[PDB]
From Swiss-Prot:
Component of the nuclear pore complex that has a direct role in nuclear protein import. Actively displaces NLSs from importin-alpha, and facilitates disassembly of the importin-alpha:beta-cargo complex and importin recycling. Interacts with regulatory proteins of cell cycle progression including CDKN1B. This interaction is required for correct intracellular transport and degradation of CDKN1B. There is a cross-link at residue 3 (Glycyl lysine isopeptide (Lys-Gly) (interchain with G-Cter in SUMO2)). It comes from the Eukaryota. This is Nuclear pore complex protein Nup50. Residues 1-118 form the RanBD1 domain. The modification N6-acetyllysine is found at residue 100. The gene is NUP50. Interacts with Importin alpha-2, Importin beta, Importin beta-2, NUP153, Ran binding protein 7, CDKN1B and itself. Does not interact with TPR. Ubiquitous. Highest levels in testis, peripheral blood leukocytes and fetal liver. The chain holds residues 351 to 468 of 468 of the full protein.
Length: 118
């Protein structure tokens, strides 16, 4: 039987932001998608390491572009919280999520589209 959990979509993955035409590992952790007080979806990512620190906590906006790269890779434009850049703080940054199975990637991208739809 399937256990109960707040987050409907939970899978391990690695975050990576684009800085100076390069990708830097933000921090290994697991993504947790769960509904918020509002009709919107809240995005949260817990650190894989023992230390349970928030890697990225933001709210899926109404307008968000999607970019599916490779087979098991996924890219999305969103505001990093906390923000890495001080000047571009307001402006979002490119983030890439590398999953274990190319299957998880597709699903992850698909869901998002639906989440942003409503």
């Amino acid at each position: 039987e399937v256990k109960e959990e707040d987050a409907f979509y939970s899978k391990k993955c690695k975050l990576f932001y684009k800085k100076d035409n390069e990708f830097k590992e933000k921090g290994i952790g697991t993504l947790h998608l769960k509904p918020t007080a509002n009709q919107k979806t809240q995005l949260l990512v817990r650190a894989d390491t023992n230390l349970g620190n928030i890697l990225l906590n933001v709210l899926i906006p109404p307008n968000m572009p999607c970019t599916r790269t490779g087979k098991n890779n996924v890219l999305i434009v969103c505001v990093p919280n906390p923000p890495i850049d001080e000047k571009n703080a307001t402006m979002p940054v490119t983030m890439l999520i590398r999953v274990k199975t190319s299957e998880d990637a597709d699903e992850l991208h698909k869901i998002l589209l639906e989440k942003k739809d409503a």
